[model samples]
Target: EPLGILQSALSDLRPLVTDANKYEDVSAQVAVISEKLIAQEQTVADLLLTCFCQCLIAASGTNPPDRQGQWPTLYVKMLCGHQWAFAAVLRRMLQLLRFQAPFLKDSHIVGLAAFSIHLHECQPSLQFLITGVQNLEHYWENLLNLLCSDSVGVCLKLCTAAISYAFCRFSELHQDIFSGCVPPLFLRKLQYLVPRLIWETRGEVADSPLNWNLYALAGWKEAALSLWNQNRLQGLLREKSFQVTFMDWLLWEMTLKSNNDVLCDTDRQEYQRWAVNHYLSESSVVGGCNGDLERGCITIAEAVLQFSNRHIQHSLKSHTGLGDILCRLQELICDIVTSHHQKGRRHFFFAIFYQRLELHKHLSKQGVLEMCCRILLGLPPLFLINTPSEKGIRTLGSEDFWQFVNKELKNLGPRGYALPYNITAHFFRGVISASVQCKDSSEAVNSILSATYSTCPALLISAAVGWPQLDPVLRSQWCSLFGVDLPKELRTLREQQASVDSCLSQGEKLSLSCTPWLSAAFLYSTVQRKKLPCSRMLEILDGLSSNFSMVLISLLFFSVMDIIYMFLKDGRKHKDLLENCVHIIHCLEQKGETWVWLFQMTDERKPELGLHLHRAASDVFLNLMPFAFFWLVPSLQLEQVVQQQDFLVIALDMYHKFLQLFVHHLDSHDVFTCGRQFLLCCVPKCQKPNSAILKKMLESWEEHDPELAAV
Candidate 1:
């Protein structure tokens, strides 16, 4: 009875929906009615409650087909089925609109999404519906015959509508879907639907409609359907949704891929088969062959990652897709940089180097995950510390290199061209600077430095900005690490030099931070141990230029402070700070200020230190003394001594007191090693010419100063 009443009412409204004058108004009214149905909850329940039971009846073939005079009545019933189904949807939509409720409870969204897809499906009559013109009449004639003969579009429409509706509700389902309740059934449907959709869209161009109208008919609707289908299929493979059955299927495919592995000899034949098979089976999918295979590979990778992370024994093994993906992403950076090769040079070694450095920084942030540490530390062996490839030959002076670059240069946009040019200039400078520092010959160094300056002043400037504080070790690493020649002119000799220089400069900074002997850490550590006080060191550093001078100043400053410390606290009040300061000046007058230069250079006996000290001394004596002479006096004694004070007396006293402090340490075992190493190894005295008095004084300290105690 209810069905009959709805049938007649719908029949009365049919003409309104069909007529041109009333169509828009009636549809608008229906839209409002759709809303009203939701407001009245009982009406909505009644409509869907009847339809569920009737759907089975209709499916069972009890429902009669619309034809002849029966067409009006049957059309009303058909319309009612559509309307009732739509009411259930509109009710939920309105409810959702009112309260922003989610549509999915579990897999319901996935299920309905699979069903809604059919609403936009192409049919002979539907062609006009989408294209807005009545055409394909012949196709409709055949389509209707097929429809009648096979119950075409009936169950397909209902099933597709159910499935697509679920898909449309995917956003609502995502919360539950992410928790691993994603429907397996949806995945199965997707497996079949995605390829078929692509096949339908890609029908032979000669046999299919090539017109613009046909193209508009598909648009994003078809594209969205295809996209979700693939997404669902791929989602089945993500770690959150990985299923055992899916995993087993993946293992099977892996076995197949292994079996299908193509060697060079068999590559063409095997690749052809694989290619054809992939095109038919996997290529149309969003990811490539491995991209399709990628779903499975990630599942295995995720498992291994989890296992490694969970075990504390190998707690070091604890890693995540976070780091691995990051590394892969890091590695891909190289590819991205290299990919831009089409814009400039065919190969970009600096980009590769930069990418590797980025990876290193990433590893540091993550606290050196095992895989990352291995990869980063191994980079020198893998990347920098290696012989050059054949492409290295073309990097320097080859015409082919520039020809390739010219082609790429033409391909660039305005801002784009400038980037590679700037990079090119930077790379050239880096190569020159690095080569100059590492190799022998000032001419070679200057030549390379000049090349770097001309081509890539940016790189040189950046290196210069960082060089001052770099440690010797880091400098050596960068200086010592060589590379295969670059792959193109952009990585020319000049470029490589600049690159090395930049890296070396950074290394120097790192080394300074890391090296125990020279770092501020060591300084602080030693200071805290009472070898030197931080406050005193700061005061000494205030008056130095070179690192050598800083050390020498530090020693003198500490010696003066120590003398005061000893005198003020002890009964020897006459051995005062002022007296010690005057004594130091007296020593300077007698020694011609040579002790200042010697103090900066350290011992020439320890080969490395000796070598450095020898060069420093030689340079200072011949080069620096001349400048010092012009500023002060040649003797640095009575020649410039002020009439107000006897500097020679002050100098003699300073030398005498300085000798007493050393004698005190050498005489006592309590601080023998500590004080001896400091006075000898740490001290940097001003240099003296090789003379009899100097050698004689050193051989017999007691002869020059009878009060000096023997070691």
Candidate 2:
């Protein structure tokens, strides 16, 4: 009876089990019957799960298996073991989900997230997404995204937790990573991932300021900044990329925020004033003021914050487009700040300077003692307190913004007409004194700065050019707001300088009394003047250069003047400062170094002058240093270099003395303006052969030669 029943069952199951085409009926049926028996076997589930877990463990390794280096196999083996165990847990959890839920539904998915949390409990160091892939890769992928969704705050929290988790575990794994010259790969990876998430959230997140973050947004920003610093983004001033853009943006944004005019008129005015002052403070900190990554980030951030000051109806009128460009710039800044292999001390200084500047602003605006400590230590975001200073200043960045009013009168012109230069000088003296005093002073200074104040022209010069937003009225109060005075000087100086440059082109010696001042003053003045348009320098009182210090001071004043000039120029008549520029040409007129400061200002439209001046300077060097001139005719002596330097220190005054003599001889009816005429015929003359010998030696240098490699 049993045999008959078995035969009947086999016959009935044959059709369902057969691979018809490959099967000769009875043989194929038998093969199919055997497969069915295996398929029905209860052990298949456990076997499949184990196999899957093993594959997950093997594939999860970041390093290649059997790599050729000297590391012990035991370490790799141990890591593999941990991975396998981790995978084992993930697989079992999936199995539980499948068995407990039976059908995949909302309840089941929620259970999966819960199960992930539970799994995270055991291997707290590993991400659930990374480990959970053993059972279902889709589940792992979906889980991470779901947890990090812009819609869900949990997602951000999850990311922060993941970063913190990785940092701790990886650090424990490698102690040298955090405290040494080299950064660990795990920590690097953590930094790389933060921006990725922030960028990913961009389209989904609102543009307005929000607390939404993996950690504190400020801290996240700081960490990104820290990574930027670790890589030295600020040191490489020549390159422009995302890292620099973001840092510039942040610091600048703070400036704008502090200066916005949406509040009551008085409040807005005060904030604007404070903002500008802070900008000056920050600028002073940037000792080597090249536009590096950190500086760039601060710049853009300030721009965004300065946007609100753009509203025409607001109490303070700011530069056009300041806000729009800044808001969007942060994204780009973040990109550069996080790049690898670019960190250094130069970058650290750049970032620290920006922070110190902000601390000064905050202290100036609000007198909170807590903020004072934070500013002093110069720590990163998480390392410091979170609130704005609690000093009673209250109306910063709020609707009551206009309570602090700084309605100062404005009329920009030369020192003689517009401002009694003495007042300007006194104002500058106070600022310089304050900066020097507070440089090492403690919390008390912070408290004093927090007290209320009024409108300041000093604020305008500091903010508009760099990071702060100043009221237009204040900007106007600064004489030379547009480039009116400096441009005239620059232009007249160039034309006259050109004539001497022309003479030098023919290998003519620079005049005895004028060569030193002619070369040094010409070069220094032109460079300083050109650099001014981009700098936010403050001027004390602009009379004229009485001596070399006066020259330096005038140059500094003009630098800011140049910026104001550009800012106020109506494009139709405006010209770039560097365009049609001139150089100071020095030729070895005689054997002795009788120096003269002869300006070789040139016009870009007329390249002839530049060529002529260049040749003249070159020829003079060759003539002056005939010894070093190959074949030992007459080598330049070291004394000439010393002579040139001495001349350089007082070249402007020396030139002025010549000017005094020339002007004395000129008829009052002369066609040329006094300033213009002086610049044209004049050179600061000197008589020093040792200095001449040094000049002769320097003529051979390749740095100043445009045609020769600077190296």
Candidate 3:
């Protein structure tokens, strides 16, 4: 019955359809055929397929082997009788042509292009046409060129209709099929239409603010980006072609017209974020440093800098908006620099800027260097990459692990180190960490430090203070440049030391131990000769946390006491030196009281704080107790002056706190230690008065050693 209905419908339209060119009014004749086809009711699809097949057969048999000029007209007659007829006929033909799109030649496509203005009259029809085609790409180029070629009024209407429909349905479609369906040509063509649409839409909003799209203005950008994503148009984004220009224009319109006055805060962020991503999306092509691609990134950085300058002048009130743009731009520039220099190959960006004084100058002029410095300093933690294994130490491929540091070293020259406090601190931290690797060049490190020290001592100290591991030659160079006056250096070290809540990094501990032993002893000897406050000298010893502090103080005390015992034994020839020994001893006696007070305070004790005091006390006692024993040995005959100060009481107090706070808490006889004999040796030298207090305290720990209870 359905076949009979379809055949009957075709029979009824046979005369006019066969004539093809004979009809006086082609529109009227096509309407009659459409009416008969519609009468087929349930057989409508069958009828439409049969009619499309007939048109295809007739089109294939045309005299000109190249259906070049004929198919456009034939197509209109074959498919344009009714809107439904056009949609149904196209749907059926496209299904047959799936993956065989090459079979539909240019002539058949020219017809769709020619008929676009008329057939795509409504949004519904446009959507149906777009969605119905199984292989729309075969006809994409022709249809796009027609849209661009259409008259201005027709172009606006059809362009808006097609794009607006696509935007609505884009998310609903399957990704692969959707991307395949929409071509870059569609976005390329919209390049011409976006600006005009914005101008007209803005005017419409201005006239009738009540019912129109309150967001119509921003919706234009949304539509353009959608088209871009749909078609994967990132490659085309870099060209000087209409698409990029259109993008810039769209960005300009949004930022210019919708500033603080019109856009809400959320709208501002959305627009700013979109602009940044659009600008940075082109960065993928900026692979190596020397090409136009590299220059392209530079241009964008400069452009954003310029935009920031302009934004501040007019819209300082929109700080969030302006700051967002600047921050994202900085991130992009930073990412670009990393990519350029990542593998330790010669950095092309560094070479370019270093070679071109003008461009190098421009970097400072635009404040791009400072931005990059900030970004460099903000790198995420290193352990995130190449995590240490089960043994808890990362060994192999360390050279690759430090590649980021190498990149920074190569790209950020002496000029880059001229940054603010935190930035400078992070820069040095990275450099110091990377310096231990055999592959990193020491000359470069020295050159950078020399440049830095030439400018500011405080900065140099701040940068170098945390570097624990370095070759002796490199360490010597840093020590030579330790330009801070002894008073200032020691005072600062004390403050850094007393922050019990503060944790020391491994590098900082190394640096603290290494430098103070050389610097503090030298400075203390010099200051004692000048008769300045050896307060700073003692501050250096007491200020360091026990981790490195005890070792440093131990070395200092040992050297000083060694000189006193050996040289000042006979005070006749070295009367002044004997007095110097007494002066140093007296100063140390006063310092010992401060250590006693620190040891008594229970309010400030974290486990680390207790450990620090314990280590400091034990180290001072060990170094001083041997000298105390030597002083008591009668052969030296120096007991009178040492006894004058009650040295034993100071030694006993230092030992008492060290054992109580640190040793008592030792869960095991931990690898970290100071010997029990050091405490026992000091105890016998204790004056008779405090001996009872010392023995009373020692009795609480009597089980740890049998000798102490016997004493």
Candidate number achieving the greatest TM-score relative to the actual structure? 3
Once model 1 is optimally superposed onto the true structure by TM-score, how far is the C-alpha of residue 594 displaced, in angstroms? Answer: 21
Across residues 434-478, which tens digit of lDDT does each residue of candidate 2 receive?
322222322322332223112122322222122112223223332
- Write one digit per residue (lDDT tens) for candidate 3, span 194-225: 43334332222111111212122354345443
How many backbone clashes are present in model 2? Answer: 92
Q: Per-prediction TM-score, please?
A: 0.26, 0.22, 0.27
Give each model's whole-structure lDDT. 0.31, 0.30, 0.37
Note the clash tally of each candidate.
61, 92, 0
Worst 10 residues of 2 by lDDT: 626-635
Ranking by lDDT: 3, 1, 2
TM-score of 3: 0.27
lDDT of 2: 0.30
